[PDB]
Amino acid sequence: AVQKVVVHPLVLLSVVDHFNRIGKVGNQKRVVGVLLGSWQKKVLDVSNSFAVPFDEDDKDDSVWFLDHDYLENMYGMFKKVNARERIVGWYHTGPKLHKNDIAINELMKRYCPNSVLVIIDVKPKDLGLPTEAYISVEEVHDDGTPTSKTFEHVTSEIGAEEAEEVGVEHLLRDIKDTTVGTLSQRITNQVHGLKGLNSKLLDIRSYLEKVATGKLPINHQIIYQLQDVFNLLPDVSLQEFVKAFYLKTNDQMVVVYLASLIRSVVALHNLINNKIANRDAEKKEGQ
Amino acid sequence: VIDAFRLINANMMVLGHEPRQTTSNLGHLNKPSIQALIHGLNRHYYSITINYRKNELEQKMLLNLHKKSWMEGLTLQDYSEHCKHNESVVKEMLELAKNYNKAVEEEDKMTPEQLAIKNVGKQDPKRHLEEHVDVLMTSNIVQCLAAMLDTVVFK
Amino acid sequence: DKKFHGILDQGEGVLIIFDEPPVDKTYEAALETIQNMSKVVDSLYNKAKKLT
Amino acid sequence: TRPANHRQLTFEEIAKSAKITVNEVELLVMKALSVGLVKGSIDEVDKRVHMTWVQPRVLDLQQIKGMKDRLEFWCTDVKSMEMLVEHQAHDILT
Amino acid sequence: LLKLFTTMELMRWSTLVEDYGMELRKGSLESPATDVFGSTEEGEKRWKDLKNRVVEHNIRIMAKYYTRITMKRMAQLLDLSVDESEAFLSNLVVNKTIFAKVDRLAGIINFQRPKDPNNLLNDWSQKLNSLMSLVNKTTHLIAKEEMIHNLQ
């Protein structure tokens, strides 16, 4: 199992590039490639990738051709180029998982005993990362239903080598805004977090709408998880949590006040120095 | 740092020719570096200007780099660690306040070397005090706002 | 002598014992910093009004 | 069945519900906690069983709908503060 | 017996002795009974130590399950009188094995340490973090079920 996975800007760029290549060549709506990386302790760093010729139908959910001969040729060649980048999984640029994903994961597992799929949604997004990482795992159902292979999510994030960071920063030299300030950036992070929480709640609400109306069968694991969450929701009017909140709010506002006073004194010192310099310069000019 | 090149012909450079045609004013790349000039630029090879392609789509993922999940956006720092950090930082602020009182005293007193050679090798109470107030105020304001937003949204 | 935090109720004849909270060091440091920055502001008087 | 706020159970209530006595409800509650079906604590001085979590239970369609309404309320609150923060910090907010 | 001592639940020493005592301290001619509790000075000491271990187990269970308790009940559940029970609890507290404040006037014992604002807000923030993680997990389950039941 892999709890954490780090994808790289080179991987993202190559995935976008492969999607564009296939779009220009024909019309598939999805592209699949192989993903090479390292195995830092319980952390999968996927450093590179290469496209492989993949095709599938839209109806049977079983008619799909993946060229593992091309896969192994390209992998051995990339091994000749660089050795540390071993097969670590595969990627497919679908907006969402597919039925074939389990079979393709088995085909990859024929190569990597612990293969991690990463859906790299090439379509631009706003409230989430572009990579969704999954790992196949057997689901031993408690209700006696037969055990079946299923995809399990693993926390995925984007990280860069030193050179990758240098390159991406050069590319974003004029777009990325760095004159924001730490406080402004953190407030932006807070509002983005609120937006993400709202998006997750809206997804759950839509699923509940579908289930209640009847499109989706009752999923007992999901219902268990939902009621566990709703029970985990805290109470902020207990008359003891309120006292603790006020006590810590004051314990923080005292420090904020001290810092503000110190900043005010420093600003007054700067003003005194500036006015002293101004008078000295003016008097010397008048001399 | 990257540069494109193609080689000048020995034949032409001996038979008096410039192996580049100056139709445009695009020969102002960077005032080529002395390293390249001494290593053989403008004699055996020439530099070709380099630009880049902007798609506004790859740039979206390059921006998605450094991005933090809403978990991190809404997480509150460990309150015990936060209190310990505030205590410590206020302690260094106290010491720097003593040193700032000392420095402001013997600042206008004499300024022959105060300009540049009175802080080298010695701590600057004003600068470090500014740094401490900035960092602690950022932390405290951010955690207060996070706590309040959490108290409401997770009700 | 502060060898334990408690109060002796004579009437009933009992001994109440308090888990006295520790003294906050942040406020101690804040007050001392306020004093030192008051010294700084006095020095700022001295610089400014004499020069300004 | 009890809500998430007034989920304090008295020995008398549990005894009436389970046809046991207040002297055995205490052992019953400790057995429940040990087997892990519920989480909480017991205050026998006031004979109140504070509870904070129960084993997830199957829900009917009406219960799913009620949970959906609760989720809608939560989503409205989240959206309200998203809007408030954005509007109040619009200047600095990037 | 090992199961009883490794179970996270109370156990009365009276029933412990009744069910097991006759076949640990004596008896079991078919399967010789060990000498760990034989009728000799050291065996008596070991039996008293077993009683102490039983009381310690009961006190630990009550400490972890109870927010508050009265001595008249703690002694009853420990099969000791109020004086011996409170002396044992005082010994444990002094040794710092178990924390418990004993309000003798009201005849109460509470095993909960005084509420700290830091601890309270830390518990609240941990609840919030677990809630965010659980909503992420549940939405991943939503995605999985939608994948399985949406295309066909």
From Swiss-Prot, chain A:
Question: In Gene Ontology terms, what is one molecular function of this protein?
Answer: protein homodimerization activity
The cross-link Glycyl lysine isopeptide (Lys-Gly) (interchain with G-Cter in ubiquitin) sits at: K176
Q: Which GO terms describe its cellular component?
A: cytosol; extracellular exosome; extracellular region; ficolin-1-rich granule lumen; membrane; nucleoplasm; nucleus; proteasome complex
Q: Which GO terms describe its biological process?
A: proteasome-mediated ubiquitin-dependent protein catabolic process
The miscellaneous remark of the record is:
Does not bind a metal ion.
The record's family statement is: Belongs to the peptidase M67A family.
UniProt-recorded name of the protein: 26S proteasome non-ATPase regulatory subunit 7
Q: Please tell me the species this chain comes from.
A: Homo sapiens (Human)
Curated annotation (Swiss-Prot), chain B:
Q: What does UniProt note about where in the body, tissue by tissue, this protein is expressed?
A: Widely expressed. Highest levels in heart and skeletal muscle.
Q: Under which EC number(s) is this enzyme classified? A: 3.4.19.-
A GO BP annotation: double-strand break repair via nonhomologous end joining
Q: What are the Phosphothreonine sites (modified residues) in this protein?
A: T111
Top EC class of this enzyme = hydrolase
Domain of life, per lineage: Eukaryota
GO cellular-component term (any): cytosolic proteasome complex
Task: Mark the residues carrying the PTM Phosphoserine.
Answer: S69
* UniProt KW Manganese keyword: no
Q: Name one GO molecular function term.
A: proteasome binding
Which keywords does this chain's UniProt record carry? DNA damage, DNA repair, Hydrolase, Metal-binding, Metalloprotease, Phosphoprotein, Protease, Proteasome, Ubl conjugation pathway, Zinc
The subunit structure is: Component of the 19S proteasome regulatory particle complex. The 26S proteasome consists of a 20S core particle (CP) and two 19S regulatory subunits (RP). The regulatory particle is made of a lid composed of 9 subunits including PSMD4, a base containing 6 ATPases and few additional components. Within the complex, PSMD4 interacts with subunit PSMD7 through their respective MPN domain. Interacts with TXNL1.
What's the stated role of this polypeptide?
Answer: Component of the 26S proteasome, a multiprotein complex involved in the ATP-dependent degradation of ubiquitinated proteins. This complex plays a key role in the maintenance of protein homeostasis by removing misfolded or damaged proteins, which could impair cellular functions, and by removing proteins whose functions are no longer required. Therefore, the proteasome participates in numerous cellular processes, including cell cycle progression, apoptosis, or DNA damage repair.
- Provenance organism: Homo sapiens (Human)
Curated annotation (Swiss-Prot), chain C:
* Tissue specificity field: Highly expressed in embryonic stem cells (ESCs). Expression decreases as ESCs differentiate.
Q: Where in the cell is it found?
A: Nucleus; Cytoplasm, Cytosol
Q: What induces or represses this gene? A: By FOXO4; expression in embryonic stem cells (ESCs) is mediated by FOXO4.
Record PTM text: Phosphorylated by AMPK.
Q: Which domain of life is it from?
A: Eukaryota
The annotated subunit structure for this chain is: Component of the 19S proteasome regulatory particle complex. The 26S proteasome consists of a 20S core particle (CP) and two 19S regulatory subunits (RP). The regulatory particle is made of a lid composed of 9 subunits including PSMD11, a base containing 6 ATPases and few additional components.
Q: What does this protein do?
A: Component of the 26S proteasome, a multiprotein complex involved in the ATP-dependent degradation of ubiquitinated proteins. This complex plays a key role in the maintenance of protein homeostasis by removing misfolded or damaged proteins, which could impair cellular functions, and by removing proteins whose functions are no longer required. Therefore, the proteasome participates in numerous cellular processes, including cell cycle progression, apoptosis, or DNA damage repair. In the complex, PSMD11 is required for proteasome assembly.
Q: Which family does it belong to?
A: Belongs to the proteasome subunit S9 family.
**Designated name of the protein:** 26S proteasome non-ATPase regulatory subunit 11
Q: Which organism is it from?
A: Homo sapiens
Curated annotation (Swiss-Prot), chain E:
Secretion signal span: none
Q: Which residues carry this modification: N6-acetyllysine?
A: K64
**What cystine pairs are annotated?**
none
Query: Domain PCI: where?
Result: 1-116
Q: Which disease is it linked to?
A: Stankiewicz-Isidor syndrome: A neurodevelopmental disorder characterized by delayed psychomotor development, intellectual disability, behavioral disorders, mild dysmorphism, ophthalmologic anomalies, feeding difficulties, deafness, and variable congenital malformations of the cardiac and/or urogenital systems.
The job of this chain, per UniProt, is described as: Component of the 26S proteasome, a multiprotein complex involved in the ATP-dependent degradation of ubiquitinated proteins. This complex plays a key role in the maintenance of protein homeostasis by removing misfolded or damaged proteins, which could impair cellular functions, and by removing proteins whose functions are no longer required. Therefore, the proteasome participates in numerous cellular processes, including cell cycle progression, apoptosis, or DNA damage repair.
Family of this protein = Belongs to the proteasome subunit p55 family.
Subunit-level organization: Component of the 19S proteasome regulatory particle complex. The 26S proteasome consists of a 20S core particle (CP) and two 19S regulatory subunits (RP). The regulatory particle is made of a lid composed of 9 subunits including PSMD12, a base containing 6 ATPases and few additional components. Interacts with ERCC6.
Name it.
Answer: 26S proteasome non-ATPase regulatory subunit 12
Q: Which organism is it from?
A: Homo sapiens (Human)
